[PDB]
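Re-run requested by the PI after the first attempt was lost when the workstation crashed. Everything re-entered from the original request form. Ligand of interest: cardiolipin.
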Amino acid sequence: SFHRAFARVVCNYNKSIEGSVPWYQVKREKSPFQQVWDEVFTPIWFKLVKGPYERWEYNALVARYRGMGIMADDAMNDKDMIVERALDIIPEDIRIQRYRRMMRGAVLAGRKLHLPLELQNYDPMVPYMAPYIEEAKFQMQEEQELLAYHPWDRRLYTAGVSGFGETSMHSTFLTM
Amino acid sequence: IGPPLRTAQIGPTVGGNGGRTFVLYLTTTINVLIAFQVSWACYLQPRWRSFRSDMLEKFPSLQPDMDE
Amino acid sequence: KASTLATGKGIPGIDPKLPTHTPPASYDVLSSGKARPVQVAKWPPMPGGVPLPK
Amino acid sequence: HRPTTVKMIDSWRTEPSSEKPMWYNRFDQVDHISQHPDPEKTEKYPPVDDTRKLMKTRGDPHIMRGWGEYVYCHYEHLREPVFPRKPDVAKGELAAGANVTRTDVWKREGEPAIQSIARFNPDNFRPVGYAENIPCPDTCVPEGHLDFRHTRLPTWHADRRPF
Amino acid sequence: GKSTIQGTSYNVVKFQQEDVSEVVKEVPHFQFYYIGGEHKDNKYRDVPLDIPVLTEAPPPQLKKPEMKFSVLENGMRIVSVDKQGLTSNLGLFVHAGSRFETPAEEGLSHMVECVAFRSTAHLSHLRTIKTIEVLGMNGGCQAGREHIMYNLELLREYMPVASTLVVGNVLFPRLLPWEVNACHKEIKKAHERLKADTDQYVSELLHQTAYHNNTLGNALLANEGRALEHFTGDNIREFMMKHFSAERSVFVGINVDHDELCKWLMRSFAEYVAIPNLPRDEAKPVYTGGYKLEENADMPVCNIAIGFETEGWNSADLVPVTVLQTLLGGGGSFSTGGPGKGMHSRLYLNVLNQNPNVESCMAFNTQYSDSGLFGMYITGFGQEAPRLVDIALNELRKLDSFTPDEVSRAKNTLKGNIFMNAENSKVLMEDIGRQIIMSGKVVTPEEFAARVDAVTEADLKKVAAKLLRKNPTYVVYGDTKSAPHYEYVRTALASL
Amino acid sequence: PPIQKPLLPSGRAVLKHGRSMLCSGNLSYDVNSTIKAPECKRGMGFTQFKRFTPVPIESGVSVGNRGWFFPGVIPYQGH
Ligand SMILES: CCCCCCCCCCCCCCCCCC(=O)OC[C@H](COP(=O)([O-])OCC(O)COP(=O)([O-])OC[C@@H](COC(=O)CCCCCCCCCCCCCCCCC)OC(=O)CCCCCCCCCCCCCCCCC)OC(=O)CCCCCCCCCCCCCCCCC
């Protein structure tokens, strides 16, 4: 059987790369060719295109946040599952101010108005969600590794779920 | 009374989305194979034929006249 | 300088205790305790980051 | 949850957050969450009269590179290594998630271990300048904006139902 | 022996600094993922089980089991026996039970149990429980009145992992706010599990009535109302700092090599600081007696218990009162016991054989470090309660004398119970851990047998007289609408 | 070889609260013992099907709540 042979090849190739250091944890010296490229192109490209373009975009983004009166982390959409899992565990103090800012932003945006300049002198790029994003990612990675390492088989279209993995009832068209 | 207590959701909270991964792989495959055809027929192929036709100036063994 | 919020206290690059940027510092040993592997390249990087078989 | 997917993968070209944080990695750590300064009772940065006087912003416009559409964001979905890079909490770097559990950055010399790990609750870390920068709104209709008080008709107005 | 602790000598295990690289080599091998494999057909697919297939087996190496005692430099005592079984029973006992709670700290001991095996400094909650599972280990945590035990039953080969996991619950527990809040569910489950066991529920009522709002009386389970206010990670940590310390902890291991267990436990505490030992208020129990009539509308039967205070485990009355319990014995109509199963105990012969209306009659003897309860437990139909109490009181009045045949039968049965109970490994582990916590010493089953043989009728009379002088504790559970009043029980026992 | 224990390990303490190996009676047949060998009133074999968990069954008690609902709240179409 040729499948049994492939299973040995896969088993032996993975046993030979256990404990390997990830590519980003290896001290890496750039190739001489890359070094020449990074001394001619990168400098000029930053001074003429990247630098100005990305400052133009960044400054506009800061202004838009200041007009809405919101922080950068407020802009995250909770349809993303990492954001949702983080928002479960934020403290109430952070949670209360986050809601009020988002509410004011939507009112202003809907009514085509902008926050009074008196209230716009703040740093919108303060990463207040960072601790909880990292915790959420850790929790999700554990679940991924310890509970979702195989494409499991389940009875299909039973109990209001397709059996293909989703956990909420009536969350697909075919599950109505 | 009071605010709801914080608790993590028992997971996994992701999964069940294989149809979207199929569309990704099908679309990438089709469009990757369209790139090969368009790159070949519109640029490479034409230039290759010209080279071969100018490699017939050597005419050591150019195509025979009859050989029908 | 940067002794008050008006003077610039807490503004990165304007406050003496806050750097303009916060790049991660280099390390010579991995957190496992293994020595950090070192590689010297003599050819340009692979086009997609595509790893090569062992 | 509905059929959903997260790009929690080991990238071949982009590093994990534990190796290269994209946020301004300076945080203030406290022993208990109550010791954080209160944003509502903290004086904010002085107001300005011109948009060209508004303070500078800690974000790095060029945090991300390569081909692609421009984006500025602090977070990604990438998976973290088994042995994450030890965060430099002494200088204010954040320690949360994988870089606390799978590292020994929390250990103190003589402190009881239970007390040491307690200080690394994600609630005990807040960004520097949080209380002096976060907007704490008291209303969704700021002063000078139109609301029902201004649009209300005079009490002698005629019935507007018939029209 | 290099150190004597509370009357027992221990060999001191010294902390050593070893590289993670070198200890990793000694960790048991196991995989969570199997990514491919080498196919190999089942060679015994055609061999019936009646045909032996194993040849050239190494000769066995049998050693008489002996209990060995060691102590780490942090003060944690390690006591292990190796009966050469193939499954081990590792347990961690901490001298922090419900009795050490202040009234404002009600239920905290149970809360610690509820948060067991949650996230630690170097392991998430999910990873701890999935490891215990993939390795086929069972166990849990139980909080008592004097101690809290964390136990894991495992194949001996995986002890290095289990020791680490158990110790992490007391060394660097991360009592994260949202993980603790997820444990509020366990309180309601605990109450249901207690009330389902009628005998244990009536025992909880006895202790609460016996010792009024003090040490042993302190409720064993937290309530799900006002107690949830301080069911928080911060509150739990403060409780652990007060009571949980290496000096008050004892790691017991059954069917484990002592030198190996000591090594891995040493490595677990070497680079970390355990909770420092601090003085705490340790007040002797105050026995008040009293009565409680708890009604269960669904039950038609009446459970009656009359108890008296005993000096406890550390007294010289322990063995004599246990002989008295076996002498009075008891049984239940539900059970049909063959020869040697208590058919000739005094209660069975005097109560069960002569009173068809009595559903069950038994003697109980709880024992704690410095106090205990002894008495009779009788059950029947609700309307029979007045007669059930009379039967119980009459038996209590017959404890003035004992026949020589009864004493000998009680002593022999007690010795048989001791030896037969001891062979169970989980029982032995819990007995050792609870012994050291209570007394700091371990009395072996053989030594207890020697004490049992020295009990005379005079000792039984003396102990019984002391018990009957205490104010009775009178608990009625179930259908209580016909039970006598507490003063009737008191007046009957006033003569004694 | 025969299996003498239920597939679901108890995971609980054998000895009851306050009872020791000296005063627990005989754990092989005592009524309060958690490891008493069951009774063969109708013969041997039913222990392979017996539920050794002491707490009576509560039909329909929920165990599949991932924290999405409060107690007493009825989910509607799983939401
Ligand atoms: C007028 C100008 C014309 C220009 C024409 C050419 C323009 C090309 C533009 C795109 C390529 C730029 C250069 C690429 C260098 C190599 C990159 C590489 O290795 O990437 C790995 C690298 C993985 O790094 P990563 O950061 O870990 O990725 C994380 C992702 O989230 C991944 O998420 P995940 O973890 O879920 O993984 C999803 C999975 C999804 O992958 C799949 O679905 C796998 C299956 C489809 C792709 C591979 C097979 C395609 C078919 C090949 C031929 C089969 C022949 C079979 C013959 C059989 C005969 C029997 O993909 C991957 O894992 C990475 C591969 C991504 C797909 C593309 C791989 C091939 C790259 C080359 C594209 C074609 C170039 C043609 C050039 C023509 C001459 C100029 O990928 C990236 O850097 C990101 C993606 C970049 C490419 C996006 C492509 C979008 C789809 C359309 C492609 C074609 C567009 C143009 C069509 C124009 C005419 C229609």
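Saved to the shared folder this time. The helical segments of chain B are 19-54.
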